[PDB]
């Protein structure tokens, strides 16, 4: 009834206190209530889990680099702890992808929320592909490509090329091509096309929309400088 408002309120408190694992649990409970999320509530859910999985990814990369050096003569300890962090990361991604497929993507009212949720599905499948190995890896990469592509199709038909959701989607999709899909030419092609088409329509933007579009365009241009 009115407990849903308390869950969102405590999520804002957890954000002020930088308790992002608590914030994610509060937003998970708000989503599980069944009601749609607003633009604010969409970002609260995404910010919470991005911080949680973000620290797990950074820890996984540190342990993985140490494991690579250790395999050139120590023991199992590095592998065992890296696998434990790998399990927590997979549990967080499975929780996010669970909320998306069972609540959010289905009950998506507008194109903005539907592209946002499908972009999340591609992002957290991409995080799983970062740690996947064999049989899972190719099956996970296909799920990320499908989620990204479905968001690309909706954004292409419903959004201007300067839309920050469409821009951020293409930014993460180009990174997906470069790192995960092993398609650097497709990654650069997507980043150039996204940057160019957004550049053409920059003059039509308003002052409050201009700043958000050019922010992502710089990130697209930053990756192109790194990749070429």
């Amino acid at each position: 009834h009115m407990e849903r408002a308390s869950l969102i309120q405590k999520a804002k408190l957890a954000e002020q206190a930088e308790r992002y694992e608590d914030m994610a649990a509060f937003m998970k409970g708000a989503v599980e209530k069944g009601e749609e999320l607003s633009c604010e509530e969409r970002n609260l859910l995404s910010v919470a889990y991005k911080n949680v999985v973000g620290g797990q990814r950074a820890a996984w990369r540190v342990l993985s680099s140490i494991e690579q050096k250790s395999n050139e003569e120590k023991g199992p300890e590095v592998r065992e702890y890296r696998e434990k962090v790998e399990t927590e990361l997979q549990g967080v991604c499975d929780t996010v992808l669970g909320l998306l497929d069972s609540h959010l993507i289905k009950e998506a009212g507008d194109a903005e929320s539907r592209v946002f949720y499908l972009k999340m599905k591609g992002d957290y499948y991409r995080y799983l592909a970062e740690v996947a190995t064999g049989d899972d890896k190719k099956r996970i990469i296909d799920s990320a490509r499908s989620a990204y592509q479905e968001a690309m199709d909706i954004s292409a038909a419903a959004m201007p090329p300067t839309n920050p959701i469409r821009l951020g989607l293409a930014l993460n999709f180009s990174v997906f091509h470069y790192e995960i899909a092993n398609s650097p030419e497709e990654a650069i092609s997507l980043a150039k096309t996204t940057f160019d088409e957004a550049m053409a329509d920059l003059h039509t933007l308003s002052e409050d929309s201009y700043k958000d579009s050019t922010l992502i365009m710089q990130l697209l241009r930053d990756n192109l400088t790194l990749w070429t």
Partner: peptide, 8 residues
């Protein structure tokens, strides 16, 4: 800066 950039 030395890493590629991804958005939310």
């Amino acid at each position: 800066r030395t890493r590629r950039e991804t958005q939310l």
